[PDB]
């Protein structure tokens, strides 16, 4: 129940604001900046500010704070969802999120803000649907918004019906400094880039553990996703009844389903780090990386970030495989590897000096994070079975999909 959603800037200047209820004076935005400065300087800064009886909820964008003031006990979650939808719409319409576009497309920006929500109640959220009525370069509103299918525009015609899927894997590993992995969760991501003619209704079928058990085929390798969240086009009733994944695919790239379950397998990369840090004399980086993934798989663009000392200087690198570059901006050593075949073992020996003068304050021990990304690898073993592409006119579809395994929250606690 936000009173007015506004777009601010890094210097406190409001790029654009649009009142929806009018219950709060527009001059309250001036006090938002001092309140944020005080909260940050005292550690009490939070996304939802509070200026007396009015709460100033704001989120940090690429360059501006999307502040949405409110007065009553409105749905904070609803405000957050509206802000996320607005951010997605801005990203779709504007390729850049900075002050260069905020002051460059205000003519269409005002119309989009007016059309998106009214009186604090969001009404339009389809970026593709909104692009059919609001353009920066007007006809009646499309019937798709009025119709039940607001995620599949009818009448779309394509020369070919090719859909590019994406089996994106997220390997999140939380290895403590004691050597044990605490948080080992893998989040699936079934994203498809559908480009076909008409309004096809995808009939998804994969190797799910629940589906195999229900059909009686619970004996092969089936993925038991702890959390499975369908997209907007996905029908909740069909999945609730018999795990029937039937929905109308959108026009373009969209996230249909996203698996989320814990992992009980060994890490794909085993990283052993050593710290022979002399007392203000030198430091040793006994970093050893063991690839626990299958030898048939290669981790392309592997970047094992090793945090070096804050005041460290004059580093010397004695490694075996992979380029090592010390970036002073990040204050860490990135064990950069172009391609890392599975089962590889790379040994590195860092050595640098330290200033004689001791530091006045501690710097902390940031965790070691790697940026491995091995495509065409399915650690979870979930295999897609079929995708029921049905059209009223009738056409032969040629769906495509690629499985990509990358490194997510794969942080390693430092000693």
């Amino acid at each position: 129940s936000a009173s007015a959603v506004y777009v601010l800037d890094l210097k406190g200047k409001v790029l654009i604001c649009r009142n929806y209820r009018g219950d709060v004076d527009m001059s309250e935005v001036e006090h938002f900046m001092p309140i944020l400065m005080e909260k940050e300087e005292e550690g009490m800064l939070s996304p939802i500010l509070a200026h007396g009886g009015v709460r100033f909820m704001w989120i940090k964008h690429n360059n501006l704070y999307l502040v949405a003031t409110s007065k009553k006990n409105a749905c904070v979650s609803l405000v957050f969802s509206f802000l996320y939808k607005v951010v997605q719409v801005f990203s779709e319409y504007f390729k850049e999120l900075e002050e260069e576009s905020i002051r460059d497309n205000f003519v269409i920006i005002y119309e989009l803000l007016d059309e998106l929500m009214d009186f604090g109640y969001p009404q339009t959220t389809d970026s593709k649907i909104l692009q059919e009525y609001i353009t920066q370069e007007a006809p009646r509103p499309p019937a798709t918004v009025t119709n039940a299918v607001s995620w599949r525009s009818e009448g779309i015609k394509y020369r070919k019906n090719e859909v590019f899927l994406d089996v994106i894997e997220a390997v999140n590993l939380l290895v403590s400094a004691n050597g044990n992995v605490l948080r080992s969760e893998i989040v699936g991501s079934i994203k498809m880039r559908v480009f076909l003619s008409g309004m096809p209704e995808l009939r998804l079928g994969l190797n799910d553990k629940v589906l195999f058990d229900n059909t009686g085929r619970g004996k092969s390798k089936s993925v038991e996703l702890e959390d499975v969240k369908f997209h907007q086009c996905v029908r909740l009733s069909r999945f609730e009844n018999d795990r029937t994944i039937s929905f109308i695919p959108p026009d373009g790239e969209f996230e249909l389903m996203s698996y989320r379950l814990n992992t009980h397998v060994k890490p794909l990369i085993w990283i052993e780090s050593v710290i022979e840090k002399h007392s203000h004399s030198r430091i040793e980086y006994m970093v050893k990386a063991k690839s626990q993934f299958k030898r048939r798989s290669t981790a392309n663009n592997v970047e094992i970030h090793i945090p070096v000392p804050n005041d460290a200087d004059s580093p010397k690198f004695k490694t075996t495989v992979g380029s090592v570059k010390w970036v002073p901006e990040n204050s860490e050593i990135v064990w950069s590897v172009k391609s890392f075949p599975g089962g590889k073992e790379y040994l590195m020996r860092a050595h640098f000096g330290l200033p004689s003068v001791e530091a006045e304050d501690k710097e902390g021990k940031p965790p070691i994070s790697v940026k491995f990304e091995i495509p065409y690898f399915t650690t979870s073993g979930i295999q897609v079975r079929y995708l029921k592409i049905i059209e009223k006119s009738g056409y032969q579809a040629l769906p495509w999909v690629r499985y990509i395994t990358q490194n997510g929250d794969y942080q390693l606690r430092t000693q």
């Binding site: 899927l165 065409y376 897609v384 079929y386 995708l387 690629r402 990509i404 395994t405």
Partner: peptide, 18 residues
């Protein structure tokens, strides 16, 4: 080619389940 795993053809449904 393309980084992240080459695109592969997909079926229409579980032919083994009728």
């Amino acid at each position: 080619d393309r980084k992240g795993g080459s695109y592969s053809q997909a079926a229409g449904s579980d032919s083994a389940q009728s």
